[PDB]
């Protein structure tokens, strides 16, 4: 506690009273003539000290501090995610203990936890007879962390494994867990540093924090202090001269990442580390969002002209791809213009994402499923793909990404609507040439041919299905003939009701001969298929038979409502057409006045069917989000639906932070 080493890289004296042994070192550093007055022994000592200090990031002191330039460079093979070179390196005969240490860290990173304990045992037994306690202490930490990992993995395996994984998985052998429990039953962590030789405890005080959990604790307390400070700063909208709260956060963040990774300790892959990384990154992106829209009153242009916007690099991409969670990502992007921030040096992030795709293909192609490595990698890959939509990606890279995503990804964590939305946002930034169109064609062919039997039930989180898959293709491509489904239709004789209907929703992607053949033996007038026939306008305008079927469904719905009200039951359905009758009657699609006989059944039905006599207190404000733009245009022309929606917009716009409501108010109603 004699000096402070600030995050910037300066030195501040704390408790010294005699000679300043610290500042004289930098005095010798700056001077050149006085360098030569040391002997050869002292010269080589000073050279060693110089290289050590330059590599560890210390530069100069405050009284000599000016415009400093700090950087981070991680050479650890784990961070770059080149698993191939790791499985190449492990196939090598080690020469020293440090090589074994790096190998054990590798097997821990590759998810091969089993023999990782064996290598830890080897390094523990072959290290006692030498004077370097760093390796021994690090081995202790690694083996304890591994043991805890096995215990928690077994706990969550026997807890919910049988239900989430489909079938129970026992990757860990019984004798191994029995032996590790027998030898771990009486191991405490609070005494490792105290109960190990004196020399380690004086010479290496610098390794004390790794003993207990207090190192993450003391990182997180400072992180939280910075979170409060930054939040207060955005609330007040002040300025930060010199160094700012975000650069110090980022520098401590990078320094912690580098130290935690390079020295090859396993604690980098756990939930608390995830929270640290996540809250730091979330603060960074949120402040980047906020600084974009600073008002600037009289001062900003003089100092910060041509705003140096935050540039997101590969170092800023891999971490987000690795640790975040999809729920957290959709939490964050709803409060920021995530599209706006630039993306520099796309080549290395491209190679990163292509690497994920290729090793995903290699892993899932093999019959050997390494479940242990499988657990902690799904979220990594999903976050990588989620953030991959925010970068222009090479055409060959796009092809690899789409061919991996549509083919090799499991159905377990990727619903059909999920996969579709993911690919849609991916294609938002990149064009649609013949390649990715061809992969989507191959995929829809594969899913269509897999559905031929009478028990291939299909599910989706949103009931999206291949309908909108084909709709996207029709939205980009125009004359797509689909010789494959054309042949499939040519081979579709009869007694394939599920197969016929599912492809029937893919009508625009068929050929003229294919659609002519499919028109026969087609499901004639199913009410749901009436809705599907006028989804986009297959049957362009309403026919009287369609209205008769609509009134039949309305009678069924009203008798069902009577039964439910007798039983006191309220139902919510994804196939709620209740709004739809009111909508089509509102815009004169149907001229039948029988719709008024069902007023009071559904709140949206009442709102749309009877504008004059609707109870405007029953107007849920979440209904406007699901209306078309021209529906919003026509809703601002009728006097009945005018006096109240303006007030509703007025009150939600000040009682909510949802910008879509503001857009609806601004663009259309005013």
């Amino acid at each position: 506690y004699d000096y402070h080493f600030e995050v910037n890289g300066t030195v501040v004296r704390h408790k010294n009273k005699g000679f300043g042994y610290m500042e004289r070192f930098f005095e010798l550093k700056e001077s050149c003539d006085e360098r030569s007055k040391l002997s050869k022994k002292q010269y080589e000592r000073f050279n060693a000290l110089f290289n050590f200090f330059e590599k560890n990031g210390v530069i100069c002191m405050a009284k000599d501090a000016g415009t400093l330039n700090t950087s981070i460079e991680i050479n650890s093979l784990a961070y770059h995610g080149k698993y191939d070179v790791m499985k190449k390196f492990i196939e090598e005969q080690s020469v020293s203990i440090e090589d074994d240490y790096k190998k054990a860290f590798f097997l821990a990173c590759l998810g091969r936890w089993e023999e990782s304990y064996d290598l830890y045992s080897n390094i523990i037994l072959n290290s006692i007879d030498e004077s370097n306690g760093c390796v021994y202490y690090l081995s202790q930490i690694n083996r304890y962390r591994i043991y805890q990992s096995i215990t928690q993995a077994v706990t969550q395996f026997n807890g919910l494994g049988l239900l989430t994984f489909g079938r129970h998985y026992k990757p860990f052998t019984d004798e191994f867990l029995a032996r590790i429990e027998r030898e771990m039953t009486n191991f405490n962590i609070d005494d490792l540093f105290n109960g190990m030789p004196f020399e380690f405890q004086k010479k290496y005080k610098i390794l004390e924090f790794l003993s207990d959990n207090q190192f993450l604790y003391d990182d997180t307390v400072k992180l939280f202090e910075l979170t409060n400070k930054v939040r207060s700063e955005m609330s007040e909208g002040s300025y930060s001269f010199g160094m700012s709260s975000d650069i110090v956060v980022l520098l401590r963040l990078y320094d912690n990442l580098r130290f935690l990774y390079e020295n090859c300790l396993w604690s980098v892959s756990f939930h608390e580390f995830h929270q640290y990384i996540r809250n730091s990154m979330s603060l960074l992106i949120e402040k980047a969002e906020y600084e974009r829209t600073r008002d600037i009153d009289e001062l900003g242009f003089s100092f910060f002209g041509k705003k140096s916007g935050f540039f997101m690099e590969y170092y800023d991409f891999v971490n987000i791809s690795r640790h975040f969670k999809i729920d957290d990502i959709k939490n964050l992007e709803r409060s920021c213009s995530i599209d706006k921030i630039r993306f520099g040096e796309q080549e290395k992030i491209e190679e990163y994402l292509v690497g994920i795709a290729e090793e995903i293909t290699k892993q899932f192609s093999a019959n050997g499923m390494n479940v242990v490595f499988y657990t902690q990698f799904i979220s990594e890959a999903k976050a990588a793909l989620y953030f991959a939509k925010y970068v222009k990606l090479s055409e060959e890279g796009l092809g690899k990404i789409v061919k991996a995503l549509l083919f090799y990804f499991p159905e377990r964590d990727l619903d059909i609507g999920k996969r579709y939305v993911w690919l849609e946002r991916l294609t938002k930034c990149n064009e649609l040439p013949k390649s990715i169109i061809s992969i989507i064609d191959d995929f829809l062919v594969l899913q269509a041919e897999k559905h031929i039997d009478q028990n291939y039930s299909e599910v989706s989180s949103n009931g999206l299905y291949s309908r909108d898959y084909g709709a996207l293709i029709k939205h980009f491509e125009k004359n797509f003939i689909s010789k494959r489904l054309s042949e499939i239709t040519l081979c579709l004789t009869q007694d394939k009701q599920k197969q016929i209907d599912f492809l029937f929703k893919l009508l625009p992607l068929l050929s003229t001969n294919a659609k002519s053949h499919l028109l026969s033996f087609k499901s004639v007038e199913n009410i749901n298929d009436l809705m599907n026939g006028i989804r986009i306008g297959l049957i362009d305008e309403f026919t009287p038979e369609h209205e008769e079927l609509i009134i039949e469904y309305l009678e069924t719905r009203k008798v069902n409502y009577i039964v439910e009200k007798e039983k006191g039951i309220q139902t919510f359905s994804s196939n709620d057409y209740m709004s739809t009758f009111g909508i089509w009657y509102f815009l004169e699609e149907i001229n039948n006045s029988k719709m008024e006989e069902f007023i009071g059944m559904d709140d949206q039905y009442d709102f749309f069917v009877d504008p004059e006599n609707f109870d405007y207190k029953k107007f849920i404000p979440s209904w406007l989000k699901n209306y078309n733009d021209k529906l919003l245009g026509k809703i601002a022309g009728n006097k009945h639906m005018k006096h109240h929606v303006i007030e509703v917009l007025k009150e939600r716009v000040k009682n909510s932070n949802d910008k879509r409501y503001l857009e609806i108010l601004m663009n259309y109603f005013i």
Partner: protein, 151 residues
């Protein structure tokens, strides 16, 4: 007696095609949310339509109490997509008397969370798991609610 004000709920999960009791009991978190959204996935159409009212829609929910079961666990030790039903009690603010019970059931569900806690400190069990609301083309799905208090 000063100010906390607590209540209670009850959570059940079933399985399709069998009367199986394989699930936890009592939700400490019981966090519930509803998500409805729309995008430009149909930024262009052949005009003169009626509408589609896509609306996406999504429901999320999570619990953590453990000790789910042991007998049916043994029988399964050797894909119906599961079934969930809920029981909650509502009180009248005027009388604060036990008069109404709320019934909630979702036919299709999916517990999909991380299969890794990876925590340094020993926990008191409770493997929190989130749930999602699936869908099919057939009919209904999501939520069917029955209201008690026929007094």
């Amino acid at each position: 007696m000063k100010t906390v004000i607590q209540d209670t709920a009850d959570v059940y999960f079933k399985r399709k095609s069998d009367g199986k009791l394989v699930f936890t009991a009592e939700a400490q978190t019981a966090s519930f949310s509803q998500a409805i959204s729309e995008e430009k996935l149909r930024g262009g159409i052949g005009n003169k339509p009626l509408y589609i009212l896509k609306s996406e829609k999504e429901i999320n929910l999570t619990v953590k109490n453990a000790f789910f079961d042991l007998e049916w666990l043994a029988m399964t030790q050797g894909s119906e997509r599961y079934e969930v039903e809920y029981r909650t009690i509502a009180y009248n603010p005027d009388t604060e008397e036990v008069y109404s019970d709320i019934y909630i059931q979702f036919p299709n569900v999916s517990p999909s969370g991380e299969f890794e806690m990876s925590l340094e400190n020993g926990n008191a069990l409770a493997p929190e798991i989130k749930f999602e609301a699936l869908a099919d083309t057939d009919t209904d799905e999501m939520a069917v609610v029955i209201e008690a208090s026929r007094d």
